[PDB]
Amino acid sequence: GMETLELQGAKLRYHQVGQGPVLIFIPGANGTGDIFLPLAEQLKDHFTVVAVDRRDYGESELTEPLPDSASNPDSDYRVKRDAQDIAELAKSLSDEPVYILGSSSGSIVAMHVLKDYPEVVKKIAFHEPPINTFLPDSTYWKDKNDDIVHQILTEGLEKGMKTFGETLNIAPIDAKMMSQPADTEEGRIEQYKRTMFWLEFEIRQYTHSNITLDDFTKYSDKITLLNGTDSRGSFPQDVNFYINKETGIPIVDIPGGHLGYIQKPEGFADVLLNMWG
Amino acid sequence: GMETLELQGAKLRYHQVGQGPVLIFIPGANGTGDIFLPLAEQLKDHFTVVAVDRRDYGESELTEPLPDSASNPDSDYRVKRDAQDIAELAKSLSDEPVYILGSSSGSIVAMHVLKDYPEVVKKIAFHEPPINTFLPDSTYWKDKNDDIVHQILTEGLEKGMKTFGETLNIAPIDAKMMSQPADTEEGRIEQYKRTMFWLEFEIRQYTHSNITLDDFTKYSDKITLLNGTDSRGSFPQDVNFYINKETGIPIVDIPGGHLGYIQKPEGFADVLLNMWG
Ligand SMILES: *[B@@](*)([O])C1=[C][C]=C(C(F)(F)F)S1
Ligand SMILES: *[B@](*)([O])C1=[C][C]=C(C(F)(F)F)S1
Ligand SMILES: [Mg+2]
Known about the structure:
Two copies of one chain form a homodimer. By secondary structure, the first copy, chain A, is of the alpha/beta class. Chain A has three domains: 125 residues, Alpha/Beta hydrolase fold, catalytic domain (Rossmann fold, 3-Layer(aba) Sandwich); 33 residues; 64 residues, no CATH class. The first copy, chain A, contains ten helices and nine strands. In chain A, helix 2 crosses helix 3. The longest helix of chain A has 31 residues. The interface between A and B is large, with 131 and 130 residues. Strand 7 of chain A pairs parallel with strand 8 of chain B.
């Protein structure tokens, strides 16, 4: 049971309980207003407690996707947009400046609400802010944040792909090709996005999907199985050997490895022309 | 320039090179058709080569969000939709059944095109498929895939959070609360996605966002800095101490820790009510 304010680019959802002057709670890391609901109950007889799901979280919905620069660590799009959400939320519920509390990164949003929309602010509270920009040692703390985020975003992935490599016995050539960075940064950032997506939304769902041997036998005359000449011993060739074992469907060898169609396009094509040309 | 076919919930983009019978190439992990163009160049005098950007990748775009259950590892929404795209693409490019080659996860899409839309297949080729469902050792390979993806998705995040709370001296009760797993498999998936979004899209961007001490001093009578009585020594209280030392803006102690509003709501309210009630 949530309220909705439609705004530029999002349906902003929020709880509202009580009577009197409006009191907006801005969540921190958890991003959602439910975490203030026991606090609201203790306040609903003095303030109209409004507790927001910030537009990227919870029951709030984006109506158009984030800009691609939002992943840049010095992008200001999201913090400024959250702060404008709170100001428009205030302006839609009150004709007076309102009370505001933010906690942790939510208190940083609160700082930007006061900076950019001081006319909506009656009183404001910053509960344990982690912003570092104005500290004498801002650099130390910014560098810690950057390096721990970098570790999280990269280490486990690198290890897991190598573990995939040994477990599946991927050929060296494929391994280097399949894990080579892009010459640009716009192409390099996309490639982490894409790999993360394949991992969460493709590999498990597709490799355990609803194909039976019976499906191949039904139309056996149509099917060729292809094994690369440079990827012998790898797990997908064993998939083809098993299909062939149980169905009789022929295996054709074709040049290159798992990526043979671009490792060796000429020889790849010569085989496809022999089969189908 | 690429070609476009508009389907339910997606605009599907694809390269088209050559003439002759239609030959559809379905990409695996990289998900885009460009990887087939050097091959397409070798076949263009024999086939109308069609190299697809599957709908979640490349120059294709969704026109509706993925279903929330698509992150479920047992989901078959994506593989079915991909298979249905290829069938629709074939039907839009030929009145005769066509030639189709899929590679790796793209060969799995090709298998579902055959199962569910055999009417569009003249011949089909499965290049190095990694599907395990029908293998006699299926449990082995399914559980390897599940474990390695899970490790990739969770391991470095669990380590980095632990490093974060220790660099920042987050209170034990707070670290306990902010890492506690959700109580459902579906709750944990969203918890993971939420934390992963916060790390990539919020922590660096907000904590180094453009706020200066003069932004506070300009409205000093409006502000209260709040420190939890149970999170002493933690980095955010250090931030508040600095703001206070430089601007004289008051620090008020409020019960609980970084999550005090939920940890002790009664005592948290009593302070707020002292402040603004
Ligand atoms: B409250 O959610 C936070 C306390 C420290 C934070 C950072 F990691 F940004 F330093 S966030
Ligand atoms: B081709 O891109 C693949 C070879 C092995 C794969 C899996 F990780 F699923 F086993 S995918
Ligand atoms: Mg604005």
